[PDB]
Amino acid sequence: EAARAQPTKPTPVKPNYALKFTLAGHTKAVSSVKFSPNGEWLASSSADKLIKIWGAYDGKFEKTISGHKLGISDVAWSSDSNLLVSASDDKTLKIWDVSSGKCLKTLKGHSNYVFCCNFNPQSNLIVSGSFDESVRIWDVKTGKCLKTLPAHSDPVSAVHFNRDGSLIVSSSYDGLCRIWDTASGQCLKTLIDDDNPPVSFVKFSPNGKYILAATLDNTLKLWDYSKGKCLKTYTGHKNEKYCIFANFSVTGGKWIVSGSEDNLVYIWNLQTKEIVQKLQGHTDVVISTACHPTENIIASAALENDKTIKLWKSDC
Ligand SMILES: [Cl-]
């Protein structure tokens, strides 16, 4: 209670994530969970055609958002935490007012399931990837498609803007990770290696220098996209069948976090590539993980035999 009255070789750090809450309510597989940028909320999407909003710190159910006619594969937040965008099998994205639950815009243009979506940092744009093999860039304000990029020759598994919105990275079962100029629509670089497995996920690092890429040979890799080379490889998990989300955990220790088809959340040391924790609790494939913006909190979500989201917290 008073600072003066309190008493004062490096050893590797490991996190100590422990289960705090299980969030149930979806009636089919959960597909994606994302924390709001302001840290207050978690949004989840599901095969049940619903989005649900939950308290990030207490896991308290807040609301259900509905309107899509078929199941939903992804959801993402605007930078101000006020909007969501969702990507559905109904071939549309919808933009939602989080406070009201209302659909503000339906984004029509894709000719097959919409698989992945994200706002840019400005949040004037949304990027989407589809089974129709295209990446589309949309105007948030008008709902109009601004550009259709003939990006891939198979479904687009992920799309992500870099920290200033100047680049988009896309991935596909076609084996490619492609980097696009947001303004011009031109492909600036294609990351390719000899092994060339299907690419199931991609995301820029927070500092924008690296790209984390998941491939369906049970591997995650960290690319330096400027240098066009692989810096790090993370293995030990199972990933041959699904587009599982992975993350840079930056609030405490510097980790890579992923789901896995063995029903665990995996956490690796980014530099050493050693697995530092495996989180056991889910009863089906962990399709999605997300890391809280400011606290050492992970959200995880699982497929049809589980249908729950779990919140885990660590001291580091
Ligand atoms: Cl380290």
Side-chain angles (χ1 to χ4, degrees), residues 1-237 239-316:
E1 316 298 42
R4 193 182 296 271
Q6 305 302 306
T8 71
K9 284 174 176 180
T11 178
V13 69
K14 298 197 194 187
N16 68 340
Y17 282 94
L19 182 62
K20 300 295 168 191
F21 301 100
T22 299
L23 286 46
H26 283 292
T27 62
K28 300 199 64 54
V30 182
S31 54
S32 183
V33 294
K34 303 289 183 66
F35 286 106
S36 62
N38 70 10
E40 290 290 309
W41 310 107
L42 188 74
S44 60
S45 57
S46 171
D48 68 11
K49 314 182 195 183
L50 308 175
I51 293 158
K52 289 170 181 291
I53 308 303
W54 319 80
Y57 304 108
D58 58 9
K60 175 184 154 181
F61 168 85
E62 187 65 26
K63 72 179 76 180
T64 305
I65 293 171
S66 61
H68 274 299
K69 299 187 267 195
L70 297 175
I72 303 167
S73 288
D74 206 1
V75 63
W77 292 90
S78 65
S79 60
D80 70 1
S81 306
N82 287 325
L83 305 177
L84 289 166
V85 65
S86 54
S88 177
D89 280 17
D90 69 13
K91 306 183 293 184
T92 74
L93 304 106
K94 288 179 181 281
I95 300 177
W96 308 91
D97 184 291
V98 180
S99 66
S100 72
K102 281 175 179 172
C103 178
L104 301 176
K105 288 287 186 300
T106 301
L107 304 184
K108 312 178 173 295
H110 281 300
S111 61
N112 209 329
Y113 315 137
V114 194
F115 196 86
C116 49
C117 55
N118 258 313
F119 283 89
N120 67 342
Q122 189 181 338
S123 291
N124 67 311
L125 303 177
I126 288 158
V127 62
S128 59
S130 170
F131 262 52
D132 75 11
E133 310 182 357
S134 75
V135 172
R136 281 178 179 251
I137 305 171
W138 308 84
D139 185 78
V140 171
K141 176 192 73 282
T142 67
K144 289 204 271 175
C145 185
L146 299 173
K147 284 185 170 65
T148 303
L149 316 177
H152 295 284
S153 66
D154 247 8
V156 181
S157 51
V159 286
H160 189 236
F161 283 97
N162 71 342
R163 63 168 177 192
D164 68 352
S166 67
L167 298 175
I168 291 159
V169 63
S170 67
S171 57
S172 170
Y173 298 87
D174 73 6
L176 305 174
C177 164
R178 309 191 78 196
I179 299 151
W180 305 88
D181 187 280
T182 301
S184 79
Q186 304 307 303
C187 182
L188 302 185
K189 200 171 187 157
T190 296
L191 303 176
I192 203 167
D193 53 27
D194 289 352
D195 281 358
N196 198 54
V199 185
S200 46
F201 186 72
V202 282
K203 198 182 190 171
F204 282 101
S205 65
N207 66 20
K209 297 198 290 184
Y210 316 119
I211 294 166
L212 182 60
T215 47
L216 295 185
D217 57 357
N218 313 291
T219 302
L220 277 155
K221 295 192 288 296
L222 187 69
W223 290 85
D224 185 313
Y225 77 89
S226 298
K227 299 181 180 174
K229 76 178 187 167
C230 182
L231 303 188
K232 303 288 172 176
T233 309
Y234 313 92
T235 60
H237 65 310
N239 190 16
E240 286 178 358
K241 289 178 170 174
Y242 297 93
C243 297
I244 299 181
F245 294 87
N247 303 275
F248 293 83
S249 176
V250 299
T251 50
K254 298 308 176 302
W255 322 122
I256 297 293
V257 174
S258 182
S260 180
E261 298 159 5
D262 64 2
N263 308 354
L264 296 173
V265 173
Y266 280 72
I267 309 184
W268 295 260
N269 177 301
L270 191 151
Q271 298 302 343
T272 72
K273 310 164 282 176
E274 290 181 19
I275 297 166
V276 295
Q277 225 189 333
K278 295 171 193 169
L279 317 182
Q280 178 167 73
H282 283 293
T283 56
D284 205 344
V285 173
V286 178
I287 190 69
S288 178
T289 57
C291 296
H292 191 276
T294 62
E295 297 293 316
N296 303 317
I297 301 166
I298 290 167
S300 61
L303 302 181
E304 191 73 23
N305 293 335
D306 181 313
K307 305 177 187 76
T308 68
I309 300 142
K310 288 177 190 284
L311 297 175
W312 316 78
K313 179 156 184 306
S314 172
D315 293 321
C316 69

